[PDB]
Amino acid sequence: TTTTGESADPVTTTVENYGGETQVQRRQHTNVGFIMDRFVKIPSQSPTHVIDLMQTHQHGLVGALLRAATYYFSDLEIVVRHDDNLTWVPNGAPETALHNTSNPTAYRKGPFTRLALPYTAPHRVLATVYNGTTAQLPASFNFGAIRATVIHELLVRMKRAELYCPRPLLAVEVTSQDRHKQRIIAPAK
């Protein structure tokens, strides 16, 4: 094509430029709602664990795609397998509010209980990085705090998420080879 380029204008050329044709694209999978709808395991804390993102492991799917955007908005669906009644609080509740139990709770029901806890933070849209204390994110970007006597696991799934302001993504490191060469799953023999 030979576009001016230096302006960093978004140029996209197609195979049409040499007697090709461009087939139809179905990108219903790389969508940011459909890719943020899945569960992702946040590290569990035995006492007064606080539920919020940016605690997931960086390389997991939801964790990475999350750090891929500065400002994320999303409601949570949480899945906790606790051992006593589990109490939640909104975003600005004093840490002593967890023992009142009149605030939202869930009693032991066999396996893991699944909650939906909406987005309560007062900020207009959260952030995955905060330049300047006001590196640790400020105390206000959490969703709630969930406190059970012992928490075994927490899974967190962001509903109707919308991202903003993309960021680097950092695929795996490679070392002096042609390609990464990871053992892909193969049939038995």
């Binding site: 500065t70 990085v129 330049n131 302001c165 680097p168």
Partner: peptide, 22 residues
């Protein structure tokens, strides 16, 4: 926006943000 430090792997694809080549 919201500058955090680069590990020098992020600089390879730092183009995501609004930018111009000089």
């Amino acid at each position: 926006p919201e500058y955090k430090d680069f590990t020098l792997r992020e600089k390879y694809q730092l183009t995501l943000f609004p930018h111009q080549f000089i």
